[PDB]
Design a protein around this nucleic acid. Structure first.
Ligand code: SF4
Ligand SMILES: [Mn+2]
Ligand SMILES: [Mn+2]
Ligand SMILES: [Mn+2]
Ligand SMILES: [Mn+2]
Lengths: 95, 340, 554, 91
DNA sequence: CGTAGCTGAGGCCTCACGATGGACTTTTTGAAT
DNA sequence: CACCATCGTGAGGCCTCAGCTACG
């Protein structure tokens, strides 16, 4: 069972920002100007929180990780006003 | 033979297929050709390029394209889904259950290892000033042990005799240093091969042995052979039992020789080691200096597998592996080992 | 002699937990991760992976705070890499880090870790130290839990050393735990297969529901003949004509399939290699040219057993009988359940069912492989003769099957091409699954090795042809995935447009990720997981652990 | 019963941004550089989504509203790496 | 009067477009009840 | 389709605040 995580950050050093944008494209897909949506099971959430405890500087950065739900029933939990919202789908890439 | 491996050193390179030919280009400018008649594995170094048409033409002819990093670190193979090599693997597995197969190849490997050891004695003996030659009693002793290895009855006897002879070689290994005892680099004749290295010289020896084992593993897997099913050593626990079986002749030439190179060239010094309650381990700068040294020894050319054409060591390994698969399945009797 | 290496003390920790677990992890490699192994590595890495002070050889009076200290004694027979060593002058004490809370047991430390700490304590005593104690430093609450080297604790440790030595030298993998609560989290439950081996080895129970797979992704299919797959760090961007068509997250990718003249930049290949993500090169039409390997699979017992049994005739014969009997049974079942007639034809003709069942049984009583191949041919001929009976309620425009056009190189029917593509694209799945369990996909018992078709994937796919390949073809034609316009003629025969290939591949993927219920164990398992489970059960059967291979007849 | 909502926006016109920062301080408390946490019952969530359908321009802005949970059990659902996270308290 | 409202100056966030480069390291450890 | 993908410096676009004018 996988969950849908929403990750939003404030990073106060451009190098650390590059490092974190690096890592986050490693894990989820871009959603908003500083927000990523990640569809992860347990192993990968452990990996993500391991990565973002060494990418960031705990003194002045801020990363927020929200566990919306079981990633099958997230659509009632998210309401988007501008663009459409479409959760990450677990299917192969055929192209 | 049939052909030889092609090593594409240039990270710039772009490799295409020209009909029956494999063309190397540099900057839209040609470099060299292979032409697939005398080819073997195509080794591509870091960020080289191999056009997918050329890759398909390699696969259809069942040529083991191998990918190395820019430095030369192995990263993987690319084998074809044809019976080219499964014949070799099934011959290896069917024949590993035999007593003369195991015993005979073991006897050959040990006699070659001993011969390389004594030849390295007569090469690199540095008891200089008063003992320009090794004691011929030692040389006669190792010759006698070599005959004994020729006529060992069974595997356990060969293992015991091998251990003996290797020990009496290591008795005078320290005799081969910069001229005397290497105070600051002490060598223990008896604490050999325990898992943590208790001596700096033994640390170098173990690290060189491990790198040689890795090279032999990748060379064996390049050909269609299972490195983990050995004839002389024992298979399980994750030990590569065929790399360990075949690296025995090559221990003096690539491991002992590399250590002697890097210790008689001052590359490795007492300051490079850290000692801890029974463990002497290298420092990082020293570790990768020694890796460079192991490369430099692997880059040298030696001429005579059986055909005199001055191959680098890293390709002599493949030549030997192919000779092994060719001994199996019954082409060439008795696997003509490489001895200098 | 060298009949056994020095026992790593972590394998000593595992042996007192589950002897089968120690056997798997030590004598056959065979490790896999889950939530907790990954979490524990994460705990240990940030501090104790990096070294620290050395344990002084000459100890008089000074604090010893060594970290990641590697000892071994060969009189004892163990080797260790102690997480930390706290000692005042000459009285040292091992400290092992853990991951979770303090356990809810008397003494705060379970039986295994106590044995590990005692073993490390003996090792320290060997090198001239006075330990007489140890600790467990749980990283989460850093609640150091002391452990005292009681005497029968040392008795347990030495007994476990001897027990592991004997069970490794014997060469017989110890049975699984009996319905234990340890197993549902041992991170090898996908390899131990505890309940399945229990049930089939006649220690009969009811297999508990699948301890589900975790941390595995879905394939990457590159069907476009002008795609360029390049690395973009951890993603993997597939750009076609210099525009980003799609990205694939490498953490979520489990294979790569390169169809035709699709290029893969060498850096992307290296990054795939660093993760052992299999990369498979295919022709434009699905021919399986080659794949990527890396210095073999460290499990040797599996391959040794496979080859040694391959050199045995009646083992090959029994396996082949099982396989094609399963194939014929599945063909019958498919013919039934998806026959679509109108009236007096809407349900299967029993004469055909008589012929097919009689052929099933004639194969079950086969004398040798020659007659078995003959019977397989005859039954497949009848099945395909009636195959067209049951798609779209009859042939459509151009969607014409010719039963005599099967089994040869250029497909000159639309549906013949569709079948050949499905077969050649299931062979890849089977090859990957078989190579991922330590087996050698090319040494087969029934089929003979020939280019592009590994002899063992062709074997173990025989039961699954009707369930996956033919079922995908049927569902694709019926649902309207493919109509006649999707095909293009050629001098060779028939082929599919890109719009057809993408839709068909998506359909095949949906089939592979489509849950079923196992006839024998009765739990919902996807087909992709089922292939791995069946490969593992074949390894067990060749191992002599279970009496016979479960063929999955439905 | 009240729920905890997390609201995050991208606004491409400074006037609309002022209008929305206006409205959002009307409803919840600042959390991150463009994120507000709101503890609202049903009437107030209806009010908020009514306000942010006329503050923003649907063509090019983007406002995201996440319903974490019942606002009593939100703490297991939110993990903050930098500053502390403390939900809105009704007192 | 006071709070609604608009301007600047700085701080986050990302992208197209450039130049360097040229990682990879022994064996162990790593959960679970 | 010419080494290829990590590093990183500019120019613009979001996001907020302090300081102003009007004002009622
Ligand atoms: S279920 Fe897992 S832990 Fe239990 S005996 Fe089997 S492999 Fe070992
Ligand atoms: Mn942000
Ligand atoms: Mn030896
Ligand atoms: Mn067949
Ligand atoms: Mn924002």
């Amino acid at each position: 069972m996988e969950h849908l995580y929403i990750v939003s950050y404030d990073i106060r050093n451009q190098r650390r920002w590059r490092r974190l944008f690096k890592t986050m494209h490693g894990f989820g897909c871009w959603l908003q100007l500083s927000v990523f949506q990640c569809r992860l099971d347990r192993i990968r959430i452990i990996k993500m929180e391991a990565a973002i405890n060494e990418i960031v500087n705990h003194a002045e950065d801020h990363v927020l990780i929200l566990d919306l739900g079981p990633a099958e029933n997230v659509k009632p939990k998210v309401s988007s006003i501008g663009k459409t919202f479409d959760p990450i789908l677990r299917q192969a890439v055929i192209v | 033979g049939r052909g030889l491996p092609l090593y594409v050193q240039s990270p710039k390179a772009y490799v295409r297929k020209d009909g029956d030919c494999l063309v190397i280009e540099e900057e839209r400018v040609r470099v060299a050709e292979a032409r697939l008649g005398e080819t073997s594995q195509v080794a591509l170094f870091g960020n080289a390029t191999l056009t997918t048409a050329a890759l398909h033409e390699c696969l259809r002819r069942e040529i083991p394209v191998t990918w190395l990093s820019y430095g030369g670190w192995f990263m993987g193979h690319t084998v074809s889904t044809g019976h080219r090599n499964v014949e070799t693997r099934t011959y290896q597995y069917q024949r590993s259950f035999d007593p003369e197969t195991c015993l005979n190849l073991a006897r050959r490997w040990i006699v070659a290892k001993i011969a390389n050891c004594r030849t390295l004695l007569r090469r690199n003996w540095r008891g200089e000033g008063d003992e320009a030659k090794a004691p011929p009693g030692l040389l006669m002793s190792l010759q006698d042990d070599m005959r004994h290895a020729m006529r060992a009855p069974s595997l356990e006897v060969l293992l015991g005799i091998e251990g003996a002879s290797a020990g009496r070689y290591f008795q005078h290994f320290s005799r081969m240093l910069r001229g005397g005892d290497g105070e600051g680099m002490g060598f223990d004749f008896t604490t050999r091969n325990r898992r943590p290295p208790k001596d700096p010289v033994n640390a170098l020896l173990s690290f060189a042995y491990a790198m040689l084992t890795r090279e032999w593993t990748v060379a064996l897997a390049a050909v269609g052979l299972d490195p983990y099913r050995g004839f002389y050593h024992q298979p399980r626990f994750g030990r590569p039992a065929l790399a360990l079986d075949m690296m025995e002749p090559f221990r003096p030439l690539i491991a002992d020789s590399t250590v002697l190179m890097a210790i008689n060239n001052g590359e490795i010094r007492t300051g490079d080691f850290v000692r801890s309650a029974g463990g002497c381990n290298l420092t990082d700068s020293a570790r990768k200096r020694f890796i460079a040294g192991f490369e430099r020894r692997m880059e040298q050319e030696v001429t005579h597998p059986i055909f005199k054409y001055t191959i680098s060591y890293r390709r002599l390994l493949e030549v030997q592996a192919r000779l092994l698969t060719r001994y199996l399945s019954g082409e060439i009797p008795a696997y003509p080992n490489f001895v200098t | 002699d060298g009949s056994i290496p020095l026992i790593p003390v972590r394998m000593l920790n595992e042996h007192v937990y589950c002897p089968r677990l120690a056997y798997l992890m030590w004598v056959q490699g065979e490790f896999s991760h889950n939530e907790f192994t990954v979490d524990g590595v994460i705990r240990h890495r940030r501090v104790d992976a990096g070294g620290g002070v050395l344990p002084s050889e000459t100890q008089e009076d000074s604090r010893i705070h060594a970290r990641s200290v590697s000892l071994s004694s060969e009189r004892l027979g163990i080797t260790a890499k102690i997480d930390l060593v706290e000692g005042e002058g000459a009285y040292v004490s091992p400290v092992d880090y853990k991951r979770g809370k303090r356990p809810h047991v008397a003494g705060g430390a379970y039986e295994p870790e106590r044995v590990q700490l005692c073993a490390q304590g003996l090792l320290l005593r060997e090198h001239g130290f006075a330990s007489d104690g140890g600790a467990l430093y749980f990283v989460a609450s850093r609640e150091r839990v002391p452990v005292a080297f009681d005497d029968e604790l040392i008795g347990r440790t030495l007994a476990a050393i001897d027990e592991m030595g004997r069970t490794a030298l014997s060469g017989t993998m110890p049975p699984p735990l009996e319905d234990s609560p340890k197993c549902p989290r041992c991170s090898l439950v996908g390899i131990c297969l505890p309940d399945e081996v229990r049930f089939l080895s006649h220690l009969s129970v009811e297999p508990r529901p699948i301890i589900p797979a975790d941390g595995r992704g879905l394939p990457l299919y590159v069907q476009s003949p002008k795609a360029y797959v390049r690395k973009d760090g951890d993603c993997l961007v597939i750009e076609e004509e210099r525009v980003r068509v799609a990205e694939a997250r490498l953490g979520e990718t489990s294979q790569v399939a390169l169809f035709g003249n699709a290029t893969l930049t060498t850096a992307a290949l290296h990054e795939c290699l660093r993760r052992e993500i299999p990369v498979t090169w295919l022709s434009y039409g699905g021919w399986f040219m080659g794949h990527t390997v890396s210095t073999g699979h460290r499990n040797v017992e599996t391959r040794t057993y496979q080859y040694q049994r391959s050199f045995d005739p009646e083992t090959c014969l029994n396996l082949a009988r099982r396989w094609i009997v399963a194939k014929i049974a599945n063909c019958r079942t498919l013919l039934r359940r998806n026959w679509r007639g109108e009236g007096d034809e809407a349900k299967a003709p029993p004469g055909l069912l008589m012929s097919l069942q009689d052929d099933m049984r004639h194969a079950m009583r086969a004398p040798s492989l020659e007659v078995l191949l003959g019977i397989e041919g005859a039954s497949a001929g009848r099945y395909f003769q009636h195959f067209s009976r049951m798609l779209r309620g009859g042939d459509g425009e151009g969607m014409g099957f010719d039963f005599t056009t099967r089994n040869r190189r250029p497909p000159k029917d639309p549906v013949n091409a569709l079948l050949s593509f499905a077969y050649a694209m299931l062979t890849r799945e089977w090859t990957v699954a078989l190579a991922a369990v330590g087996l050698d996909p090319y040494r087969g018992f029934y089929h003979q090795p020939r280019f592009g078709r590994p002899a063992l994937a062709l074997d173990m796919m025989e039961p699954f042809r009707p369930l996956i390949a033919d079922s995908t073809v049927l569902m694709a034609i019926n649902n309207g995935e493919i109509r006649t316009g999707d095909f293009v003629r050629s001098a060779g025969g028939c082929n599919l447009t890109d719009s057809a290939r993408k839709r068909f591949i998506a359909g095949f993927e949906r089939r592979m990720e489509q849950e079923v219920t196992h006839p024998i164990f009765k739990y919902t398992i996807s087909y992709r997981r089922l292939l791995e489970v069946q490969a593992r059960l074949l390894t067990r059967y060749l191992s002599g652990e279970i009496p016979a291979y479960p063929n999955f007849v439905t």
